Design a protein around this ligand. Sequence first.
Ligand SMILES: *[C@@H]1O[C@H](CO)[C@@H](O[C@@H]2O[C@H](CO)[C@@H](O[C@@H]3O[C@H](CO)[C@@H](O)[C@H](O)[C@@H]3O)[C@H](O)[C@H]2NC(C)=O)[C@H](O)[C@H]1NC(C)=O
Ligand SMILES: *[C@@H]1O[C@H](CO)[C@@H](O[C@@H]2O[C@H](CO)[C@@H](O[C@@H]3O[C@H](CO)[C@@H](O)[C@H](O)[C@@H]3O)[C@H](O)[C@H]2NC(C)=O)[C@H](O)[C@H]1NC(C)=O
Ligand SMILES: *[C@@H]1O[C@H](CO)[C@@H](O[C@@H]2O[C@H](CO)[C@@H](O[C@@H]3O[C@H](CO)[C@@H](O)[C@H](O)[C@@H]3O)[C@H](O)[C@H]2NC(C)=O)[C@H](O)[C@H]1NC(C)=O
Ligand SMILES: *[C@@H]1O[C@H](CO)[C@@H](O[C@@H]2O[C@H](CO)[C@@H](O[C@@H]3O[C@H](CO)[C@@H](O)[C@H](O)[C@@H]3O)[C@H](O)[C@H]2NC(C)=O)[C@H](O)[C@H]1NC(C)=O
Ligand SMILES: *[C@@H]1O[C@H](CO)[C@@H](O[C@@H]2O[C@H](CO)[C@@H](O[C@@H]3O[C@H](CO)[C@@H](O)[C@H](O)[C@@H]3O)[C@H](O)[C@H]2NC(C)=O)[C@H](O)[C@H]1NC(C)=O
Ligand SMILES: *[C@@H]1O[C@H](CO)[C@@H](O[C@@H]2O[C@H](CO)[C@@H](O)[C@H](O)[C@H]2NC(C)=O)[C@H](O)[C@H]1NC(C)=O
Ligand SMILES: *[C@@H]1O[C@H](CO)[C@@H](O)[C@H](O)[C@H]1NC(C)=O
Ligand SMILES: *[C@@H]1O[C@H](CO)[C@@H](O)[C@H](O)[C@H]1NC(C)=O
Ligand SMILES: *[C@@H]1O[C@H](CO)[C@@H](O)[C@H](O)[C@H]1NC(C)=O
Ligand SMILES: *[C@@H]1O[C@H](CO)[C@@H](O)[C@H](O)[C@H]1NC(C)=O
Ligand SMILES: *[C@@H]1O[C@H](CO)[C@@H](O)[C@H](O)[C@H]1NC(C)=O
Ligand SMILES: *[C@@H]1O[C@H](CO)[C@@H](O)[C@H](O)[C@H]1NC(C)=O
Ligand SMILES: *[C@@H]1O[C@H](CO)[C@@H](O)[C@H](O)[C@H]1NC(C)=O
Ligand SMILES: *[C@@H]1O[C@H](CO)[C@@H](O)[C@H](O)[C@H]1NC(C)=O
Ligand SMILES: *[C@@H]1O[C@H](CO)[C@@H](O)[C@H](O)[C@H]1NC(C)=O
Ligand SMILES: *[C@@H]1O[C@H](CO)[C@@H](O)[C@H](O)[C@H]1NC(C)=O
Ligand SMILES: *[C@@H]1O[C@H](CO)[C@@H](O)[C@H](O)[C@H]1NC(C)=O
Ligand SMILES: *[C@@H]1O[C@H](CO)[C@@H](O)[C@H](O)[C@H]1NC(C)=O
Lengths: 165, 165, 165, 321, 321, 321, 99, 99
Amino acid sequence: FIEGGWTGMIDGWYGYHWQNEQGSGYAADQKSTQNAINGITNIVNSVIEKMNTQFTAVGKEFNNLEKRMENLNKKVDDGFLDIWTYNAELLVLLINERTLDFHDSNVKNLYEKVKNQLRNNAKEIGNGCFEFYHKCNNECMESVKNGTYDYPKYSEESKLNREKI
Amino acid sequence: FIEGGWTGMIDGWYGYHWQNEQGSGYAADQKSTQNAINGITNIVNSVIEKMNTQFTAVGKEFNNLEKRMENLNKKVDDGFLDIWTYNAELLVLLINERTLDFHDSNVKNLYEKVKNQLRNNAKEIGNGCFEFYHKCNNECMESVKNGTYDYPKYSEESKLNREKI
Amino acid sequence: FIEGGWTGMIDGWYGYHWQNEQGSGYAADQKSTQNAINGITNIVNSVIEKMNTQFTAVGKEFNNLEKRMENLNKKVDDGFLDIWTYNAELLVLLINERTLDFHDSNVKNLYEKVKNQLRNNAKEIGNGCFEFYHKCNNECMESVKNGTYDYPKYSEESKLNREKI
Amino acid sequence: DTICIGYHANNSTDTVDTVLEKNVTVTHSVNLLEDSHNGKLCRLKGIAPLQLGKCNIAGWILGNPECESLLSERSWSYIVETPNSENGTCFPGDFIDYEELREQLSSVSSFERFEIFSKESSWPKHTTGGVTAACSHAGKSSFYRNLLWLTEKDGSYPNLNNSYVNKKGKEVLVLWGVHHPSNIKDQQTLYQKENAYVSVVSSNYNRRFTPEIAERPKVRGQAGRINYYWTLLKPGDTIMFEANGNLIAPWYAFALSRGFGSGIITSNASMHECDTKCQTPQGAINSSLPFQNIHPITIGECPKYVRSTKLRMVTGLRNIP
Amino acid sequence: DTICIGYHANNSTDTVDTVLEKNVTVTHSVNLLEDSHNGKLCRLKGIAPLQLGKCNIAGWILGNPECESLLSERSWSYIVETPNSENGTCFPGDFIDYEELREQLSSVSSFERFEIFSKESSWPKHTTGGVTAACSHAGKSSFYRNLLWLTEKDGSYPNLNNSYVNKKGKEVLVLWGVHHPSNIKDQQTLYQKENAYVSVVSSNYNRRFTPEIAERPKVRGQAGRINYYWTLLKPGDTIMFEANGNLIAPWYAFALSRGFGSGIITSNASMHECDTKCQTPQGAINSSLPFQNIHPITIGECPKYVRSTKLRMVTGLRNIP
Amino acid sequence: DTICIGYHANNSTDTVDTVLEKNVTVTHSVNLLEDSHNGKLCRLKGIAPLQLGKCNIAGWILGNPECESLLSERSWSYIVETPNSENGTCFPGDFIDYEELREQLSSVSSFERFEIFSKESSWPKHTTGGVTAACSHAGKSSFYRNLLWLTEKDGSYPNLNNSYVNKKGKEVLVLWGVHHPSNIKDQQTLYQKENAYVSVVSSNYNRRFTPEIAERPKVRGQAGRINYYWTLLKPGDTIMFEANGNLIAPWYAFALSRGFGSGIITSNASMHECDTKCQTPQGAINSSLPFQNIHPITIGECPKYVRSTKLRMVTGLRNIP
Amino acid sequence: VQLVESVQPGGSLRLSCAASGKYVNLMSLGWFRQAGLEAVAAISFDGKKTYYADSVKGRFTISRDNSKNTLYLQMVYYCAASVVDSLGVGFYSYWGQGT
Amino acid sequence: VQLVESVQPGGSLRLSCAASGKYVNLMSLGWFRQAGLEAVAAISFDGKKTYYADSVKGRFTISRDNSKNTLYLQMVYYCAASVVDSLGVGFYSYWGQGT
Ligand SMILES: *[C@@H]1O[C@H](CO)[C@@H](O[C@@H]2O[C@H](CO)[C@@H](O[C@@H]3O[C@H](CO)[C@@H](O)[C@H](O)[C@@H]3O)[C@H](O)[C@H]2NC(C)=O)[C@H](O)[C@H]1NC(C)=O
Ligand SMILES: *[C@@H]1O[C@H](CO)[C@@H](O[C@@H]2O[C@H](CO)[C@@H](O[C@@H]3O[C@H](CO)[C@@H](O)[C@H](O)[C@@H]3O)[C@H](O)[C@H]2NC(C)=O)[C@H](O)[C@H]1NC(C)=O
Ligand SMILES: *[C@@H]1O[C@H](CO)[C@@H](O[C@@H]2O[C@H](CO)[C@@H](O[C@@H]3O[C@H](CO)[C@@H](O)[C@H](O)[C@@H]3O)[C@H](O)[C@H]2NC(C)=O)[C@H](O)[C@H]1NC(C)=O
Ligand SMILES: *[C@@H]1O[C@H](CO)[C@@H](O[C@@H]2O[C@H](CO)[C@@H](O[C@@H]3O[C@H](CO)[C@@H](O)[C@H](O)[C@@H]3O)[C@H](O)[C@H]2NC(C)=O)[C@H](O)[C@H]1NC(C)=O
Ligand SMILES: *[C@@H]1O[C@H](CO)[C@@H](O[C@@H]2O[C@H](CO)[C@@H](O[C@@H]3O[C@H](CO)[C@@H](O)[C@H](O)[C@@H]3O)[C@H](O)[C@H]2NC(C)=O)[C@H](O)[C@H]1NC(C)=O
Ligand SMILES: *[C@@H]1O[C@H](CO)[C@@H](O[C@@H]2O[C@H](CO)[C@@H](O)[C@H](O)[C@H]2NC(C)=O)[C@H](O)[C@H]1NC(C)=O
Ligand SMILES: *[C@@H]1O[C@H](CO)[C@@H](O)[C@H](O)[C@H]1NC(C)=O
Ligand SMILES: *[C@@H]1O[C@H](CO)[C@@H](O)[C@H](O)[C@H]1NC(C)=O
Ligand SMILES: *[C@@H]1O[C@H](CO)[C@@H](O)[C@H](O)[C@H]1NC(C)=O
Ligand SMILES: *[C@@H]1O[C@H](CO)[C@@H](O)[C@H](O)[C@H]1NC(C)=O
Ligand SMILES: *[C@@H]1O[C@H](CO)[C@@H](O)[C@H](O)[C@H]1NC(C)=O
Ligand SMILES: *[C@@H]1O[C@H](CO)[C@@H](O)[C@H](O)[C@H]1NC(C)=O
Ligand SMILES: *[C@@H]1O[C@H](CO)[C@@H](O)[C@H](O)[C@H]1NC(C)=O
Ligand SMILES: *[C@@H]1O[C@H](CO)[C@@H](O)[C@H](O)[C@H]1NC(C)=O
Ligand SMILES: *[C@@H]1O[C@H](CO)[C@@H](O)[C@H](O)[C@H]1NC(C)=O
Ligand SMILES: *[C@@H]1O[C@H](CO)[C@@H](O)[C@H](O)[C@H]1NC(C)=O
Ligand SMILES: *[C@@H]1O[C@H](CO)[C@@H](O)[C@H](O)[C@H]1NC(C)=O
Ligand SMILES: *[C@@H]1O[C@H](CO)[C@@H](O)[C@H](O)[C@H]1NC(C)=O
């Protein structure tokens, strides 16, 4: 939907951008990015918990008539190392895929939240952005962020303006 | 969207709820529940099938001059236990999230299927509940459940009453 | 939504279908198929590279009075085989689930791209097809696939035709 | 009039863990981890175990007097010891390749304990049945039941020349010992010669032993030592014993019947007449869940052990009344 | 005018399994598990294997008469035994540290069978080339090819004195034996003294051996026994042999050249002129797929082994005509 | 009048891997792999290690003259050897069960060194303090510091009779040796007997030794050998020594205090006064990440080792400016 | 992943393509020509199946064999590999230098 | 995950914040103040980078080190932690008691 990420926004991952007669700028949705970074922290917490501490892992010495036991010890060390290298790389790949899917889901959920809050009172331009059928001052622009948009307060004007469309 | 589950649904994971001149009540959906339980039973069966049995994991004894072998056997046992504990916990986390993703997909599929059946002959509310533009008796409600909502017959009134908006 | 796949199409994975006053048939979308092929090839390379080669795993002989070492070696071999059998099967299940979801997402993305291009110039139908309100010749059809569907060049004339419904 | 969709919600308490979320409440969940047990020894598929009481494998095989009740047992599913097992070798010494014998015996389902050498007639020119105060029984001095202590008769200790042909259909476990007095006076009184040997040979085994006389610390009250040995005879194979002195000859051997799924466990629990499919040293995990956290040692088709404290899977919906 | 969007449908019936679904039909698939093999012992990187055939490592290294053809081999890629590889030590006895020798030989890429001590002029005062009926060749008694049996001459057996200085640039595997006659008569007739010793010493090896005389069961028709020993001389090192008797003296030794990727396999397959990168007892593997379910044993860059029967992966759409 | 949604984008160049795409630029990421170190041996949990320098465990335990400085150490956290450490057994010979001793010493945290037998009063009738040129120090012949070489006095060498009662509350490590001259003339000159023996016995140990005399290749200029043995005494247990020759008597023993988390490593790094929680033979680790790739060998609580070169987790969005 | 490959009023000229890059053996190969770009022929892995364009009319038996993982075509041209066992133009991603 | 922390018409006052709770060492840390709530300063893991509010003007050098996983601020106030290497207010989730 959205062509690309924003570079001017610095308050958080997810945010809005707005323009009206009174001004324009960026802002981050604190609730959303909190709910997101909680998830990231849980992932990080899980990794450090499942990966038990590795205690002393010194080697062993073997006589010249103990090559079989030496190779068996070498096989055990190599086998566990291959298994744990595989587990670490696979886990990283799975986590990365889920995190990026998670972030995409949140952006979509935030986008739907704005659409539903407006009660289909503004035209969807595609491109990830909305264009209002009514003028929305800073008070209204803050209202959409708070999640307490009052549709009847603008419905009459929005319907009246829709006639000229 | 849907703000929590219904506690009046005695039967079925998923179902409907309606009220009209003939009364109100709850009822499960056979096909959606069947698909969901089938999908979850597959995960349970896979968990039980792919995890083989642990046959006779008895111990071993060593002399005082066999400390190296004893530590090697201990290292083998501890390494396998740690690997399989990690596998068991990761597996449970993976299958858990799919189930909660599978359940969410199933409910959303039901919502879209009902919407398409009604064919924009009813007002849509964000909480997941549709309001008809016409009188809808038990036969109409069962028709919606039966996946055979008779749009052409009911649309005759809607053609007029929908202008009431 | 879409009622099954197409057996008439031969080239490409995801494709279009069209019929108008000057022809009918099918045509694949190269951009989407190539990207999907890159994604699958990436998975294939990942699975081959992340799995190591069994360079040499010849057997071992033990004396009558070395049965403890023989059982320990047997336990090591069986334990690694069980772990790798479990990793291989679980990996296959994970990649299959991701690949099938990847195909479904790709079809939905193209469907949304068609919607954004047409922008309510056609009556969308559940089966996934788009029925226009205006004449759309081969040049019009080709423009739809090429991503150069000019909106006003087809929209205005359809106003009366759509209202006549 | 209105109809609408929803999902089941109820007053359950189960909680599960996902990768992104923790402590999430669900309607229905399957406990995939066992944490309970019946706490007894049970009949594993209809065959009772071998209940070694006061004595361990060493006292069971050698025939320690304090556990003579084990001589009637002939078949079992698993061997169960106790932490109070101490009545092994009553006379101090070293059991050579004792851990290997435990490994061999962990795969035996049954045996036939028989008299390899007849005490009454096999040693006509020796004195049979010496007793030691370290192996006292019922207040009197006694000795193992499976090993015979040989000494001089009529002022001489002739050469020993005995063999056994394994005409049983199974492997036969042969055990013997060699004595290491503490001084030359005991060697002369017992065997009437300061230099002596013991030779044991078969189609696969070959070894020679020599006594070593030296003063040692007292263990169990004794200053001497007895070293115990063992071999497994293959069917049709012959085992030959030759000794000039210091022999503690076999008396009873075991024809071994091999099996699968058996083992040796150490447990404090009691026994009762109950069938089970899985047995930990603690108690029967008679349940069908995939994982358990009770004990790593198992006998039978047991669930897989994981150090986890819980493993619950979602088989239901999220609940949010 | 109408336009529509869909996906490919195919009249091919591949099926795949996922976490939530089983036996799902897919248009295309790729198999990640190899189950086909050449079925023959192929050449590995241009070098043929050491097909021992009738005899095994012990017979090959001692050079028993039944596989004298192997004595011309100098380089190989892997050692191949067969299920009917029975010809090893034709004279009964214990090959001590045999499994260690097998492990050492599992890394050798070649050797030079050279003559440490010349039979003609290295033992001028002893009879050379004794024979036994347990190692018959062409119906006539013979002995090992790489070892020399020494015996009295003119009614006497002088002390042995020989030693070898490793002027080769590699390790030399030295083999010898100590004979253990069945009775004193054979000891006297061959070596002319009841008490004899053998002492083999190097810069890192030091051991002494003594005969043991006893009656033993007849194995391969002989009541005697030869215990076979070995050591590896380091480059520049010296090995000294001293013996009052009972020495099966070395004749030929091997200057070993080490390598990588070698091993010992047991196979029933036939030889052929084809080349390969991976070899199994079943046969060669000609695929680059990540998994394998042919045999756990591998030589060379082989795909990983798994017990699965099918590991198809989805590389195509779902099939719903 | 417009409002709409997006996400953060920055200057980052961090790249992460996923199942479908490689080399994806992400705004924020956490490296899970540690590769940085300080390259010094540091004190582990407040206790300094035992740096052996020239000597190895064999030289340090046997008191090789170049190891005279290590005799003042009492406690450590781990033992450190160096690649250039070669001052072990200054007199050639085999150190029996040497690797087992290294394993035992890997679990020891401290030790007290005492005079088990008094050089001045416990050997009245034998000459104490033989010296050899192979173990020279300061330009003179010398010998080990924990071992005492006994020799005839006034043309005699009576039987040794000493013993020791372990009245410490700890295990005591006793070490000795048996001397193997090169010829009978050395045996007679040193001990005045051709055949000698050495017997060591306790409640848990029993062993006898006999000399072996034969010409051997010169190592460090000596044709003779000394074999080194050891045992561990349980509390209250008594160790007795008997010998009429060829005994390299014990002089200083050790009382062992066990501990957890110790080990032996081979390192070329220097020493400093710094604290660490994780240590490698290369250098310290200073991190909380779950994985590392610096070395497999570790002492303490260290991250898991993985061969991977980069493990980055995504804690941010896709970077698509 | 890569591939390497290498006319008169009469007869037919043979040409060959060789797999290159990482374990290309697991991928199907096909041939293409440009005067527009169009497919000519393809062969699945292990030579299970063959496809040809309309112009082939079933001639030009293709094969692949051991030597350097090569394939041959005989009675500018480029070869490409794809992971899908189809001649579809869309499934090819890795192309040769053309000859 | 938690953190613990502890004026006149002249000079400047030192104050410190210390990590608490499960392996917060992995986490970036910063300072905050309220009269409304606003950020003041932040520092990365391993002290790689530092960030400041507008009022700092580059003064008030921030640092942290091993001892008690402490960080210091010197020439009601709170400190908090975040997985994200940024000063942004929205990124921070776990907070101290204020001092
Ligand atoms: C079977 O095992 C039991 C238990 O290990 C042995 O009984 C124990 O025998 C020792 C030696 O006779 C007893 O030590 C003595 O205790 C008395 C006091 O009762 C003390 O005055 C002596 O100085 C000496 O320390 C020990 O108490 C006794 N324990 C029990 C519980 O009775 C038994 O001898 C073993 N029998 C065989 C045949 O192996
Ligand atoms: C071992 O555990 C299994 C279960 O894990 C036990 O099987 C259970 O046995 C009881 C009877 O002792 C069964 O309960 C009865 O089931 C009938 C079914 O109609 C019901 O009418 C009764 O009211 C009663 O609930 C139970 O079904 C059966 N299975 C399970 C899963 O519980 C078994 O008895 C235990 N012992 C042995 C020796 O196997
Ligand atoms: C090399 O190996 C082969 C096969 O293992 C040896 O041939 C076998 O030799 C034994 C002993 O001579 C034969 O056993 C005898 O068989 C006769 C009947 O023919 C029986 O009357 C005797 O009591 C004894 O059991 C065995 O039959 C024979 N098998 C074959 C297939 O030839 C061979 O001797 C070995 N040669 C060397 C030099 O090691
Ligand atoms: C402690 O270890 C050092 C070596 O790390 C010993 O010194 C080394 O002793 C050997 C043998 O005596 C020397 O090798 C010989 O050197 C002479 C030249 O003097 C040469 O002609 C011989 O062919 C042989 O290679 C070696 O050079 C010498 N190294 C050094 C650095 O002095 C030392 O004896 C050991 N001390 C104890 C008490 O173990
Ligand atoms: C790797 O090794 C395999 C095994 O030798 C080689 O595959 C074999 O190739 C031949 C020739 O195409 C196949 O035979 C053919 O079968 C078809 C029917 O499938 C038939 O029409 C032909 O007449 C011919 O007989 C054979 O089935 C096939 N075997 C297997 C197991 O794939 C392959 O060529 C080798 N490739 C490399 C690069 O080493
Ligand atoms: C351990 O970690 C600390 C903190 O991350 C390191 O201290 C910093 O090291 C960098 C160089 O890597 C210097 O630029 C910083 O100035 C150091 N911090 C301070 C407060 O001075 C330390 O170097 C690491 N290693 C050791 C051995 O302590
Ligand atoms: C849920 O609450 C009802 C009463 O509101 C009670 O009867 C029922 O037992 C509760 N559920 C459970 C599982 O106890
Ligand atoms: C989950 O609940 C347990 C108590 O059952 C608690 O100790 C833990 O902190 C909780 N974790 C989360 C993330 O809520
Ligand atoms: C004594 O040994 C001989 C073998 O030398 C044997 O023939 C004889 O049967 C033996 N005597 C007895 C009584 O077993
Ligand atoms: C051992 O078993 C007895 C009898 O069942 C019991 O009294 C005692 O508490 C048990 N000991 C332990 C440590 O469980
Ligand atoms: C699919 O059907 C076509 C005819 O419609 C046939 O030519 C082709 O061979 C079929 N596919 C297979 C794999 O047989
Ligand atoms: C699916 O595949 C095989 C037979 O093709 C069989 O094991 C299985 O039972 C079939 N169905 C299910 C659900 O497993
Ligand atoms: C043995 O060889 C040595 C040389 O190594 C020589 O001096 C001696 O005379 C030979 N003979 C005897 C009996 O030692
Ligand atoms: C071994 O190969 C032979 C010859 O091909 C064959 O007859 C026999 O059945 C094979 N046996 C086994 C066990 O492979
Ligand atoms: C990104 O880097 C450019 C220079 O490469 C710099 O001008 C710009 O300020 C940077 N952006 C941020 C947010 O620091
Ligand atoms: C792109 O991937 C290749 C192969 O893994 C790697 O060598 C290279 O460093 C990557 N590039 C970047 C910018 O990460
Ligand atoms: C030998 O030691 C014993 C035991 O301490 C002692 O009784 C005896 O007097 C000692 N004899 C000599 C000669 O040292
Ligand atoms: C050890 O360090 C020294 C000094 O840097 C160097 O000369 C020597 O080569 C190093 N040896 C090893 C084995 O690292």
